[PDB]
């Protein structure tokens with residue numbers, strides 16, 4: 315006897331306990347009033363008229379089930395469901411040197427975004443009348459590594475300022491991608507504590523004036539809001555969070571990250587730490603390849619990208635077969651048969667690392683490496699359609715995603731990789747010029763072999779089904795217009811088209827002449 | 829790293845943190861009671877004569893043989909959770925005074941403080957009760 319909590323620790327340097335009233339609890343009351351386990355009034359020994367006692371907020375340890383109230387922490391599974399709800403959170407801190415001692419206050423709040431908010435040490439302090447949120451003196455933590463936090467003590471900024479700054483920076487980053495938040499953090503504890511300041515909590519509610527569920531809360535006037543229609547909202551109404559380290563990693567976060575990702579260096583700036591927590595959580599779930607059981611609602615613009623993907627695939631590789639008349643085509647990165655051009659005399663060979671159980675006999679099991687495999691595929695042509703690899707074979711038709719370009723679809727990853735999401739999000743390697751060294755960049759063209767049938771648009775680049783004339787032939791002139799439109803959409807979503815050096819538009823004309 | 833003074837015991841950890849974070853600290857607690865959660869403990873308990881004024885607000889503890897006596901700044905939820913007070917600016921009623929509760933309902937004196945409000949007529953608990961009405 316007896317058990318005590320780090321939570322609400324009284325960090326004051328006051329040597330006396332508290333008068334039985336104005337004392338928060340029987341644990342607090344001073345020895346002088348306590349007898350037989352009871353606490354007792356002594357008019358003789360006076361209550362403090364004026365006192366300031368810092369209350370530690372640490373080890374908030376909140377696990378509770380209320381039917382109306384939603385869990386703040388979410389399952390590893392449920393965190394996968396919502397990604398880029400994902401924001402890394404690690405807060406550097408400071409301790410109180412002077413008026414009181416023993417607890418920790420937020421100094422620099424880091425995020426998966428480059429963003430870094432700093433605050434003036436502020437803590438909860440008890441007086442006779444009320445508990446009062448106020449500034450405090452504080453010191454940098456002791457270590458030599460922590461010497462860099464010294465200047466940050468002075469810098470800024472009021473907390474009523476910061477919590478609005480956080481909500482806006484969170485509002486604009488998350489608005490299009492998700493309806494909610496999840497914080498990915500390494501040490502569950504401290505940043506839960508940092509959350510006291512901006513965060514509020516409660517049973518789910520709907521955005522005010524808006525349609526969807528509410529992200530934010532404004533104290534100024536009782537209201538609720540979402541990422542979208544909400545400013546001047548200083549609070550976060552129902553955030554979610556998950557602890558990566560809670561997944562059983564052996565070491566410290568820096569070690570675990572550094573294996574998978576050599577792109578994120580170390581500056582002890584709080585953002586770096588919170589980047590690394592996403593950068594590593596991504597890898598853990600999403601470097602495990604392309605789980606198809608998950609389902610991600612799309613907004614948006616993606617569906618059109620989806621179809622335009624197939625349309626540009628079909629046409630390019632068709633033409634590519636006409637032009638250069640390859641004996642065989644090696645399709646790599648095809649879990650299922652699915653010939654992009656259904657009908658060609660060409661011998662079509664399938665390869666992927668993981669074949670589908672159905673269509674397993676059609677496909678050969680292979681992981682492509684240029685080091686091993688440049689020798690073997692010499693004959694015919696090779697096709698990689700969103701099969702992302704180290705440097706590509708000389709004779710090739712490939713579509714690769716460029717991580718560098720930005721859309722609401724794709725999110726950062728390890729290392730330099732981006733994780734692209736429409737459905738079934740595939741994490742992909744970083745766009746690298748070195749892999750396209752043998753191939754050349756694929757100029758736009760449009761090819762149809764057809765009979766022909768508001769204003770005419772004539773295009774030098776296309777093989778018009780009929781080039782005798784202008785020749786704007788209302789069937790092709792319209793069909794070209796449509797394809798170039800859905801082509802310019804696929805390249806806008808940042809896909810790249812690469813072909814063998816040998817390919818030439820001209821060799822297509824010879825299929826026309828007859 | 830304590831190096832500090834412990835004000836609280838584990839059994840209350842969950843509840844207080846919940847009520848702390850809530851936009852509605854009142855409802856939050858109330859619901860929690862419903863959830864099969866334990867009510868607040870460790871609030872300050874008086875050794876009394878059990879004779880005195882029945883009144884709920886007292887400057888020095890006054891208990892009926894039925895009622896029991898509490899420090900009460902412990903039984904004020906907003907004091908106990910170190911969060912702002914229902915009164916707009918900014919002060920608390922139960923800090924600097926004592927509060928009595930019927931012995932049966934003194935299992936959860938914290939809610940009892942929220943649930944009921946004392947009348948300005950007899951300055952005593954309403955319904956537990958009043959000569960008025």
Ligand SMILES: [Mg+2]
Nearest residue numbers: 404405500501
């Ligand atoms: Mg941390």
Ligand SMILES: [Zn+2]
Nearest residue numbers: 575578593729
């Ligand atoms: Zn990284």
Ligand SMILES: [Zn+2]
Nearest residue numbers: 904906907920
């Ligand atoms: Zn109070």
Ligand SMILES: [Zn+2]
Nearest residue numbers: 947950958960
């Ligand atoms: Zn009355």
